[PDB]
A paper describes a structure:
CoV-N protein is a multifunctional protein that plays a crucial role in the viral life cycle. The N protein comprises the N-terminal domain (N-NTD) and the C-terminal domain (N-CTD), sandwiched by three intrinsically disordered regions (IDRs), namely the N-terminal arm (N-arm), the central linker region (LKR) containing the Ser/Arg (SR)-rich motif, and the C-terminal tail (C-tail). In particular, the N protein interacts with Nsp3 to facilitate viral replication and infectivity. The coronavirus nucleocapsid (N) protein interacts with non-structural protein 3 (Nsp3) to facilitate viral RNA synthesis and stabilization.
Here, we report a 2.6 Å crystal structure of the N-terminal domain (NTD) of the N protein in complex with the ubiquitin-like domain 1 (Ubl1) of Nsp3 in severe acute respiratory syndrome coronavirus 2 (SARS-CoV-2). The overall structure of the NTD-Ubl1 complex comprises an intermediate NTD monomer wrapped by two Ubl1s forming a “V-like” shape (two Ubl1s are designated as chain-B and chain-C Ubl1, respectively). A protruding β-hairpin (β3–β4) of the NTD inserts into the concave area of the “V-like” shape formed by two Ubl1s. The interface areas of the NTD with chain-B and chain-C Ubl1 are approximately 880 and 850 Å2, respectively, calculated through the PDBePISA server. The major interaction regions are located at the β-hairpin (β3–β4) of NTD as well as at the C-terminus (around β5–β6) of two Ubl1s. The predominant interaction mode is the ionic interaction between the two proteins. The positively charged β-hairpin of the NTD inserts into the negatively charged area formed by two Ubl1s. Three salt bridges (Arg92-Asp110, Arg95-Glu26, and Arg107-Glu95) exist between the NTD and chain-B Ubl1. In addition to the main ionic interactions, the main-chain oxygen atom of Arg95 in the NTD forms a hydrogen bond with the side chain of Tyr103 in chain-B Ubl1. Taken together, these results indicate that ionic interactions are the predominant binding mechanism between NTD and Ubl1. Taken together, these results indicate that SARS-CoV-2 Ubl1 alone does not bind to its TRS RNA. Ubl1 competes with RNA to bind N protein in a dose-dependent manner.
Author numbering:
A (entry chain B): 0 to 111
B (entry chain C): 1 to 110
C (entry chain A): 49 to 173
Write the structure that this text describes.
Amino acid sequence: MAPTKVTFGDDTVIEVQGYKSVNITFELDERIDKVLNEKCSAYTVELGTEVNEFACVVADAVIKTLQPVSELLTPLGIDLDEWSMATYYLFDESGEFKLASHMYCSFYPPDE
Amino acid sequence: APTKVTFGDDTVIEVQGYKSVNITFELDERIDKVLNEKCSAYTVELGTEVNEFACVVADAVIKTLQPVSELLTPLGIDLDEWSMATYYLFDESGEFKLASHMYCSFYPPD
Amino acid sequence: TASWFTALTQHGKEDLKFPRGQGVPINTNSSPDDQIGYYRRATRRIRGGDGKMKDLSPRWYFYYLGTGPEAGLPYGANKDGIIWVATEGALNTPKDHIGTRNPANNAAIVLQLPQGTTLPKGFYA
C-alpha cells in the first residue's frame, strides 16, 4: 500500500512503511518440502497484509517454483494442477493466522 | 536505543519499534479486574525476551497495588509475598512467547 | 469446513464442562429449537523455534447437533474430547439447516455465552 505520511514542524514530511521479514517452512509433501524451503521461502511482507492474501502470494510462488519440474513430480504422485487449486494455510509457531518472522505453510489447518 | 536516521538538510529523525501487548491477569480472581484496567497495556521494544518482560509486568503489579496494600491484607493478600513470587507470561497457546495478548499467572500454563 | 464460532481455549488441567442448560453459544438466526450440540477438543501440534514438536493449548469448538466432525454422534454420547450442551427447549433433531461455516464466505462468530454461565477453572476471557 501507501507509505504513511507523518508530519513534523512547518513543512517536513516523513514517509514510513513497515515490513515483516517472513521465512516459511513448507509442510506440503515431505519429499519436496526442502526444495520449497530453499527456493521460495523468503518474503518481505507489508505489516498490514491479510494472511489469507499473503497465502495466495505463497501459493503462486510454489506453483511458479514447481511448473518447470512438473514432470518429475507426477511420478512422485504430485499433480500441480490440483496443488494450484488447493487451500494454503499460513500460520505461526503458535498456529495463529498472524504474520510472523517464521511461518508454516500446510494443506491442513493447525487445529485438528 | 532510538535509531537516528539523517536526511538531507540537517534533518534527523529518531525511530523506535515496539509491540503492543495487552495482559489478561489471572493472579487472584478478586483483584484481576483492577489489574486489567490499570496495568494491562504495554509498549515493548521489538525483540524483547519474554523473561525480561515478565519482570516489567511484575513490577507494574506491585507498583499498582502498593498504594492499596492496607486494603489487600484483609483479602489475604500480602504484597511482600507477591513482590517476591515468579510471574508467568504466556500467549493464547500456552507458549512463553511475547505476543499481542498474553496471560499473567502465578502458575505455569497449559 | 469449520465451526460457526471461535474456540474456547483450555489453559488448566480440567476439561470443558457445562451445567445442564448452560454452554450453547449465542447466535441469532436460531430458534430455541436449535440450542443443542457439542464442543470438540482440537489438537494443535506445531514445531517450535527449537525444532521440537509442541503440544499447544487445546481449543474446543462448538458444533450444532448433527453437524460437523461428529455429526453422527447422538446427543449425550460419552466420548473423549466431546462434551454436550443444550439450552432448555432445544429439540433432539439434526441442525442441517444451520450446517457448518465456510471460511471463505463467512468469518467465525465470536463465542460469547449469556452472562452468569459457569466455565471450568482454566478457561479465561
